[PDB]
């Protein structure tokens, strides 16, 4: 019944099976499936995640319209995650008026002025990461980068969302480290075929996030609120002060902190691991970046908000890695009203999809794409890229609100790790075969050789 929609609108696409749509095509992963359909079915195609109609667009003008131009009016919210409970008030999960209220109440928290005042504090746990990196350099055996980066990513997240200056890997007993370190898949794939099961799961009070960690963060936020009763450089602080549009709730503040927590842990650790692999398989970029790191700031010169943005090559290295590996893999907006965007009728309720992975590896906009060529973002070539094709943090008023923070957190960590060690390929795997699941992480871990100086 729903499969004739994209046939009525005259939109090509793989013929879907009843009750399932095109979920069987997800056997090669979201990324492989999106690239294949872009070559065959053209610039715009449509498929079905069960009964949910999905429209893929690649035209940059349509993309701008969906993300920027007609954002508040037609394309505002994302597709329902699933059995989310009290986390429905999360800024990434809120819809329509609650999202506009939450983002305005949280936008000044990620201001360039607020990030500069937290730069010296974000380096205390970073020096602890180098201390834990020298002991691994004493061993000639390779080291998995996801655990070391996650240890740093948890320390910075805890020390920036709250005041817990910790050594996550070296102190594996604090409740803050324990809850975060504990936390496609058979569950998420079933929700796509059965969106009718989403409201039934919430009636069963079974949410996709372990409830044991939610109550632990609820009591932690309660005791931290009692600890406030001169912390002026803290995510929560900035949320409690603005609390005392409408007002921000207490449990609402608990939900957003969990967003800030996870968005800076596996997300940051994943990108940090993708960067170092490409630096290990391309040591000329590693050497030049190490040479450029010592140029703007000599050996044993601490980074600063003004100095990080000066190293031009470090920004080129993070951009190309995000291109080759956009951990989002997709951007989604729900067409909540009948709209004709760029000569195309989009009915209501249709999920409009933007394949970041496919456009990041499209030969039309990138020459030799599968090749890590960080020179694509040089001062003379960074103007040729279309900002609506390379969207690692998305775009529009619902882009990544922590883009500046995540870029600073990773760049501040990269400057200190590269000015003390070098990374050589150990036994790793050049093919770097991506995982076939719903995350843009490698199932095979990232283990390379770390050499000192
Ligand atoms: C390298 C790291 C990161 C990448 C690549 C990234 C990328 C993205 C992307 C692609 C989106 C979707 C935007 C869209 O729908 O168009 C997003 C949303 C979001 N990100 Fe990030 N992100 C990163 C780190 C972070 C961090 C560290 C935080 C906060 C601590 C954060 C907070 C958010 C929030 C709150 C949203 C939802 C925006 C809203 O719905 O208003 N992100 N991010
Ligand atoms: O917000 C988000 N948008 C988004 C981006 C791309 C596709 C779909 C979506 Cl919905 N994601 C999704 C996300 C992003 C990266 C790694 C992940 O594993 C998951 C998010 C969700 C949570 C939650 F649901 F677990 F609470 C926590 C943090 C983030 N997140 C990460 C970076 N920026 C935001």
3-state secondary structure the chain: CCCCHHHHCCCCCCCCECCCECHHHHHHHHHHHHHHHHHHCCCEEEEEECCEEEEEECCHHHHHHHHHHCCCCCECCCCCCCCCCHHHHCCCCCCCHHHHHHHHHHHHHHCHHHHHCCCCHHHHHHHHHHHHHHHHHCCCCCEEHHHHHHHHHHHHHHHHHCCCCCCCCCCCCCHHHHHHHHCCCHHHHHHHHCCCHHHHHHHCCCCCCCHHHHHHHHHHHHHHHHHHCCCCCCHHHHHHHHHCCCCCCHHHHHHHHHHHHHHCCHHHHHHHHHHHHHHHHCHHHHHHHHHHHHHHCCCCCCCCHHHHCCCHHHHHHHHHHHHHCCCCCCEEEEECCCEECCCCEECCCEEEEECHHHHHCCCCCCCCCCCCCHHHHCCCCCCCCCCCCCCCCCCCCCCCCCHHHHHHHHHHHHHHHHCCCEEECCCCCCCCCCCCCCCCCCCCCCEEEEECC
Q: CA triplet 51, 80, 24: central angle to 5 degrees? A: 40
Q: Does the C-beta of 450 come closer than 6 Å to ligand 2?
A: no
Q: CA triplet 323, 154, 81: central angle to 5 degrees? A: 60
Q: Does the C-beta of 353 come closer than 6 Å to ligand 2?
A: no
- Collect all residues with Cβ–Cβ distance below 8 Å to 379 and sequence separation of at least 6: 312
Q: What is the resolution of this structure in A?
A: 3.4
CATH number at residue 202: 1.10.630.10
Q: Which of 267, 326, 327, 438 is the pocket-test mutation for ligand 2 (most atoms within 8 Å of CB)?
A: 267
Integer Cα distance of 217 and 203 in angstroms = 23
Q: Is there a contact between 156 and 126 (Cβ–Cβ < 8 Å)? A: yes
Nearest ligand to the CA atom of 259: 2
Q: Which of 254, 263, 265 is the pocket-test mutation for ligand 2 (most atoms within 8 Å of CB)?
A: 263
207 is in an annotated binding site: no
- Rg of the chain over Cα atoms, rounded to whole angstroms, equals 22
What atom of ligand 1 comes closest to residue 260's alpha carbon?
30
Please give the method by which this entry was determined.
X-ray
Integer Cα distance of 313 and 427 in angstroms = 28
Q: Is there a contact between 231 and 237 (Cβ–Cβ < 8 Å)? A: yes
The tokens of 380 are what? 């003379």
- Collect all residues with Cβ–Cβ distance below 8 Å to 224 and sequence separation of at least 6: 162, 163, 236
Query: Which protein residue has the closest C-alpha to ligand 1 atom 11?
Result: 400
Q: Does the C-beta of 397 come closer than 6 Å to ligand 1?
A: no
| CA 263 / ligand 1 centre spacing (Å) | 7
Query: Which protein residue has the closest C-alpha to ligand 1 atom 32?
Result: 402
| CA 408 / ligand 1 centre spacing (Å) | 14
Domain that holds residue 325: 1-453
Q: Does the C-beta of 267 come closer than 6 Å to ligand 2?
A: yes
Domain count along the chain: 1
């Amino acid at each position: 019944h729903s499969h004739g929609l994209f046939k009525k609108l005259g939109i090509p696409g793989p013929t879907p099976l009843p009750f399932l749509g095109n979920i069987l095509s997800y056997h090669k992963g979201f990324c492989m499936f999106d690239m294949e359909c872009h070559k065959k079915y053209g610039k715009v195609w449509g498929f079905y995640d069960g009964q949910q109609p999905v429209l893929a667009i690649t035209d940059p003008d349509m993309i701008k319209t969906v993300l920027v131009k007609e954002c508040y009016s037609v394309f505002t919210n994302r597709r329902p995650f699933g059995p989310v409970g009290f986390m429905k008030s999360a800024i990434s999960i809120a819809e329509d008026e609650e999202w506009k209220r939450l983002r305005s109440l949280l936008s000044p928290t990620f201001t360039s002025g607020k990030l500069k005042e937290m730069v010296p504090i974000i380096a205390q746990y970073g020096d602890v990461l180098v201390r834990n990196l020298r002991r691994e350099a004493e061993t000639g055996k390779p080291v998995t980068l996801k655990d070391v980066f996650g240890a740093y990513s948890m320390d910075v997240i805890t020390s920036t969302s709250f005041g817990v200056n910790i050594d996550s890997l070296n102190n594996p007993q604090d409740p803050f480290v324990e809850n975060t370190k504990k936390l496609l898949d058979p569950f998420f794939l079933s929700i796509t075929v059965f969106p009718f099961l989403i409201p039934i799961l919430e009636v069963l009070n079974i949410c996709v996030f372990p409830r044991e960690v939610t109550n632990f963060l609820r009591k932690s936020v309660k005791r931290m609120k009692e600890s406030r009763l001169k912390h002026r450089v803290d995510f929560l602080q900035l949320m409690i002060d603005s609390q005392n549009h409408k007002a921000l709730s207490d449990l609402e503040l608990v939900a957003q902190s969990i967003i800030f927590i996870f968005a800076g842990y596996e997300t940051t650790s994943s990108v940090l691991s993708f960067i170092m692999y490409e630096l290990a398989t391309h040591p000329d970029v590693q050497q030049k970046l190490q040479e450029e790191i010592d140029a703007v700031l000599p050996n044993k010169a601490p980074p600063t908000y003004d100095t990080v943005l000066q190293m031009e090559y470090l920004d080129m290295v993070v951009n190309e890695t995000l291109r080759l590996f956009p951990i989002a893999m997709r951007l989604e907006r729900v067409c909540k009203k009948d709209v004709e965007i760029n000569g195309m009728f989009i009915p209501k309720g249709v999920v409009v999809m933007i394949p970041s992975y496919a456009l990041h590896r499209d030969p039309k906009y990138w020459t030799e794409p599968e090749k890590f060529l960080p020179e694509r973002f040089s001062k003379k070539n960074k103007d040729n890229i279309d900002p609506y094709i390379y969207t690692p943090f998305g775009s529009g008023p619902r882009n990544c609100i922590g883009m500046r923070f995540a870029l600073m957190n990773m760049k501040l960590a990269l400057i200190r790790v590269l000015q003390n060690f070098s990374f050589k390929p150990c036994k790793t795997q050049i093919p770097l075969k991506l995982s076939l699941g719903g995350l843009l992480q490698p199932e095979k871990p990232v283990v390379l050789k770390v050499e000192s100086r």
